[PDB]
Ligand binder design. Structure first.
Ligand SMILES: Nc1ncnc2c1ncn2[C@@H]1O[C@H](COP(=O)(O)OP(=O)(O)OP(=O)(O)OP(=O)(O)OP(=O)(O)OC[C@H]2O[C@@H](n3cnc4c(N)ncnc43)[C@H](O)[C@@H]2O)[C@@H](O)[C@H]1O
Ligand SMILES: [Mg+2]
Ligand SMILES: [Zn+2]
Length: 217
């Protein structure tokens, strides 16, 4: 089972990806998470991606396609995988088709989680992350027990660098221009499936699981 989770910033890709991989046990491949890992390590890629990420811009295609090609070749992807946040440009999508073909695979579904831009703005700005364990909270939609404190570890909660309002507005605009044309690209191949992301987390998961059910049928 080869899947792609596609959505504008804050649509709920990670939230759902975590639920999906816990149910099937396949790898969760997130380009944003890989770039952040490279930044922490201090690698050449991490240094370059930092500048784009901090501004809310997309990292250039060649660089991004490259780290994905490397990740997809590993043995852990033999039983399938979940791509989160890639592809997000038409060219990354063309690159993905060929990249998969090289390892004898094709996508099953490209799950488009649709949410209104005004809600996405709120999803991102109110998001808070634990500095110790990475647990995610949301001041509006799902706050911690105690303000600024992580329920799991008692750690410090903070706002991701790119989650401030000005950077969010940029993120939304560039992703809307680059990512939205992918709806028609995938609809043409028959891979596209739309999910209403403006529902409670478990309900969104059930619509996804319902879709995934048609694979085992
Ligand atoms: N392919 C690529 N090409 C080029 N450059 C690339 C690239 N991929 C990455 N990059 C670069 O890396 C950067 C970061 O990428 P990335 O880290 O991928 O950011 P993103 O795609 O913009 O979106 P998010 O990760 O922040 O949100 P998400 O959809 O996962 O939602 P989440 O589940 O967290 O949910 C968000 C919040 O909402 C909450 N939430 C989720 N669902 C619900 C719900 N149903 N109801 C209420 N709250 C909800 C969560 O609790 C959370 O607080 C990019 O800006 C770019 O610079
Ligand atoms: Mg994410
Ligand atoms: Zn914590």
């Amino acid at each position: 089972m080869n899947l792609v989770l596609m959505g504008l910033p804050g649509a709920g890709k990670g939230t759902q990806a975590e639920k999906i991989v816990a149910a099937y046990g396949i790898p969760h491949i997130s380009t944003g998470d890989m770039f952040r890992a490279a930044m922490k390590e201090g690698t050449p890629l991490g240094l370059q991606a930092k500048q784009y990420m901090d501004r809310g811009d997309l990292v250039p295609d060649e660089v991004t396609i490259g780290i994905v090609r490397e990740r997809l070749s590993k043995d852990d992807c033999q039983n399938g995988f979940l791509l989160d946040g890639f592809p997000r440009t038409v060219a990354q999508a063309e690159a993905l088709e060929t990249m998969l073909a090289d390892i004898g695979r094709k996508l099953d579904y490209v799950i488009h989680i649709d949410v209104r831009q005004d809600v996405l703005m709120e999803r991102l700005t109110g998001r808070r992350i634990c500095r110790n364990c990475g647990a995610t909270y949301h001041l509006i939609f799902h706050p911690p027990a105690k303000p600024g404190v992580c329920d799991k570890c008692g750690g410090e909660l903070y706002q991701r660098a790119d989650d401030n309002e000005a950077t969010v507005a940029n993120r939304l605009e560039v992703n809307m221009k680059q990512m939205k044309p992918l709806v028609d690209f995938y609809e043409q191949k028959g891979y596209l499936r739309n999910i209403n992301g403006e529902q409670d987390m478990e309900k969104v998961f059930a619509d996804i699981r319902e879709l995934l059910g048609g694979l085992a049928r």
